[PDB]
Amino acid sequence: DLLAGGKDDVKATFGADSFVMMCIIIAELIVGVAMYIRTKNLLILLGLVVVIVFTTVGLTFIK
Amino acid sequence: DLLAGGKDDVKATFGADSFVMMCIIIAELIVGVAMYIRTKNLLILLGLVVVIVFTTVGLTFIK
Amino acid sequence: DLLAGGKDDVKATFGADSFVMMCIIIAELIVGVAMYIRTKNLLILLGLVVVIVFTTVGLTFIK
Amino acid sequence: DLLAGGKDDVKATFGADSFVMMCIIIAELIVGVAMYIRTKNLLILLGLVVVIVFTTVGLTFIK
Amino acid sequence: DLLAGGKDDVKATFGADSFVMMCIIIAELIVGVAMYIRTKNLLILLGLVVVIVFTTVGLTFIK
Amino acid sequence: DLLAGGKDDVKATFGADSFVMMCIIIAELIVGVAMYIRTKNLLILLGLVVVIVFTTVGLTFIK
Amino acid sequence: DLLAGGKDDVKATFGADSFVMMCIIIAELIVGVAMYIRTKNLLILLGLVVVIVFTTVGLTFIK
Amino acid sequence: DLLAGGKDDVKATFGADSFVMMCIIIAELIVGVAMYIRTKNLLILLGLVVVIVFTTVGLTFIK
Amino acid sequence: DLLAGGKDDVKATFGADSFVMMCIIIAELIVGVAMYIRTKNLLILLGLVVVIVFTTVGLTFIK
Amino acid sequence: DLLAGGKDDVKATFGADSFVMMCIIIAELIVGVAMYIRTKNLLILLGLVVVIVFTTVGLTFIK
């Protein structure tokens, strides 16, 4: 059988609605605008979108 | 014959559905996004994929 | 003649299908991914392959 | 003349095919992989080769 | 039967609400900010989170 | 029951209004401006903000 | 209660009218003109303004 | 004579049709397209060709 | 006269057609392609050639 | 006069054509290529040359 195996709730800690998933997404926003202002090209504002989908489709592979 | 040879269930502890295999994959996600935001190039988001397959095809060599 | 010479089954303990050969290979996997995530270069995932062959071709020299 | 001089079979005990020569070579393998995993440089896997030849060409000097 | 087996209250000493669990968590905070200021990268502020969960899910394995 | 468990006032020593919390925040200011002047990019002045919130929301997890 | 808690006058040492706040502002001026002369663009002369306000509104968060 | 000399099948492990020769060629493809898209010049798509021939004419020097 | 002087066959172990000379050349190939893909400049593929000649003209100095 | 003075043949043991002079030169070759592959700069392949001359002109000072 499995040991240490536990709980999982660790998943709920890092999961969909979380504190860490909430700060990791807000940093993408705030330094996304930063690296935009210093440059002014737009692929970087789109760089926020790839974090939205990545975390979303990423978290479903945890199970 | 073999000694110490045991159980194996140690395999079930580190195996496919596990606690340690669940945290080792979630760290790839969370520091994958990190090293992405500080840079914004995409091979690193793909760095999560190589952990998916590596652990998958790796665990089958244990036997 | 030989003394102490025994059994060998000690070979079966450390041999091909074993408990110690099973844990020594699983550590290569789990710290292989570790040193990968902290860096993200791939020669290290290949570092698992050299343990596969080394133990394999190594054990045949015991005899 | 010689005294205590004996048998030799002591040579057969520590000689080519032996129990002690079998364990002294298997330790080189198992701690060779160890010090490899903790580091990942390859001269150490080659450290097994120098034990192969050393014991081989060493035992022939006993006579 | 068991000897020395006691009390446990030792568990209550090192357990959830404790003095030692209170200082071991506050050191993570104060040297977390330290190693942040000297560097200014953020995975380290997240290093406090992994101590929160580790002690939490760790203490439940004592029993 | 608990032992060593004490006082807490240790919390009041490292808590919200404190001497150590007062110096750890003032160092962020003074080396924040330093690493700004030597570079002149602004995410670093914002590096003071993340220490404000981190200590604030951090101290509430002590209990 | 609080320990070590002291004096504060440490605040008066690093505070509004101070020696260190006087040198940290004068360095912004002298290397501000430097990086201006070697380049001749003006956002950098404005880089002195952001140090004026930052220290000003920063020091009020110490309390 | 030769010692340790073995098998070779190690050659078959890293040889023409292999697992490692299969992944080392597929990485050239996937990061070849990457460094192409970020730039859009074509010598890099040709960079896949030089890996085809190099491994091919390289493996024949092993013997 | 000479002592310990032996055999040589140690030379045949590390000599022209060998196991160790076979692996030391195959590593040049596999990490040669690696450091090529991560960069894509060609002097490194030529780095395999200098190992071919070096071992070749090197082994003849052993005698 | 001299005592213990002997033979010399010890010189023939460590001298020009020897077993130890044969292994000490072959290690320079095999770890020379090693530290080359991990780096790929060439002063190290030249590091074999300085062992050739050093042992050569060194042994003549023994007398």
Place this chain on the structure above:
Amino acid sequence: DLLAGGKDDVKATFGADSFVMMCIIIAELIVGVAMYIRTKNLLILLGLVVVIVFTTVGLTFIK
């Protein structure tokens, strides 16, 4: 007068052309190359020179 005073030939035993002066110089050579190969910096090959002169100018102080 002097007693025990002897012979000297002890000087001839440890003197210029000797057995012990011959082995003490040959060890400098063989472990000089050793500590060179493991490192590859050259002050150590020069470490043989300082033994040449030291023994030479040292032995003349015996009288």
Place this chain on the structure above:
Amino acid sequence: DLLAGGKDDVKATFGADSFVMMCIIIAELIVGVAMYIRTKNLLILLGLVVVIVFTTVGLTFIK
């Protein structure tokens, strides 16, 4: 009651105006300039300030 308790004048020996407090502050100056010249960054000249205040506010906790 207290024993050994003494005098204090030991405090006057290590106190505000002292010989040891005079040398411990002058070393900060002289190796402060040293580590500055070898580098030329200025947080280190400020390293003298933190010794001024530390000893000052430190000595008042002795009582």
Place this chain on the structure above:
Amino acid sequence: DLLAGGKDDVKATFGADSFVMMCIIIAELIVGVAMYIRTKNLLILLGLVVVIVFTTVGLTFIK
């Protein structure tokens, strides 16, 4: 009272007109020009000025 307290003349040794204060200032000059020539930017020639004032206003805090 104070012990060990002495003389001070140690102050006169490291003080304003001294031998050590004379060499510590002359090194700033000679390696100031060095790091200038290898680069040719001028903030470094100004690096001599900050040593002039630092030692000057530093020595007055000794008392």
Place this chain on the structure above:
Amino acid sequence: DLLAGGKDDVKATFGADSFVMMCIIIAELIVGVAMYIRTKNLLILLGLVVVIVFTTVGLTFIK
């Protein structure tokens, strides 16, 4: 009084007419022309002038 205080002639060693002041000025000339030829802009030939005055007005602060 002062100790170690000496001579000064150290000043005459590094002073106006000296050997080190003669080589430190001649290097400015020879690498001044170098960095000129590789570029061909003239502020760098003027870089020799700032070494003339700097050493001149610098040496007078030694006293």
Place this chain on the structure above:
Amino acid sequence: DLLAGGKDDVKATFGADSFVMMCIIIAELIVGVAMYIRTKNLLILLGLVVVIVFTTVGLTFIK
């Protein structure tokens, strides 16, 4: 007095008629024509003149 002060002949080595002053002037000629041919504007041929006078009037400041 002065130490290390020597000879000067170092001046004669880098002086008016020298080997290094002869090569530093000939490089100005040969890369002067180069950067001319690739462009064909004439201020660059005049760039040789400024090296003639600079070294000439430069060398007289050595004394």
Place this chain on the structure above:
Amino acid sequence: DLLAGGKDDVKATFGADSFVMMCIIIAELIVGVAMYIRTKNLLILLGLVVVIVFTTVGLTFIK
């Protein structure tokens, strides 16, 4: 007199017609063409000429 002084033939090893002088010149050729092709400017093909003369006029200073 001189010690260790030897032979010279070390000079003949690194001298005019040599193995090392033959490889050090051939590397200039092969990486000279390399850095030419990746760029296509010609001062670099001339970079081979400066190695011809440098080794030539350099070797004559050995004596």
Place this chain on the structure above:
Amino acid sequence: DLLAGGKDDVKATFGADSFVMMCIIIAELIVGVAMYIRTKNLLILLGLVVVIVFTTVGLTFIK
């Protein structure tokens, strides 16, 4: 008077025409060309000149 004072001929060993002064100058040549080829800038070929004069004017200070 002086003791140990000897001979000097140690000076003749390391002096003007010597074996060690002959190898220390030839290394400057061979790694001078090396660091030139890998870069192709010329101040480094001039790096041989500063070893010529340094040893020359250095050896005269031994007396």
Place this chain on the structure above:
Amino acid sequence: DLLAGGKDDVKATFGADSFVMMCIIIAELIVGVAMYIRTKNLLILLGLVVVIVFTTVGLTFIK
């Protein structure tokens, strides 16, 4: 009065013109050039000058 007080000639042994003062200065030269060649920056050749003056002005403090 004084005992053991002797001679001094020990001073003449380690003094100005000596054997040990002659070797301690020649090592500065030979490893000065070494650490120069491996790097090629010049403050290190100047490192010989600071040994000249240090021993000179140092020996005068012995009395």
Place this chain on the structure above:
Amino acid sequence: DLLAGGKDDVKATFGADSFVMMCIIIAELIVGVAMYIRTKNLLILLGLVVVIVFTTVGLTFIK
């Protein structure tokens, strides 16, 4: 009263002008230069100064 109390002249033996105070200061010089040459940083040459003052101000506390 006092016994054993003597002479003092023991003070004159270890005092200001002495044999032991003369050798203890000369060792600081000779191993000061040693640890300098092996490193080449200058706080260590200053390590001689702290022995000058320490013995000086130390000896006055004997009385």
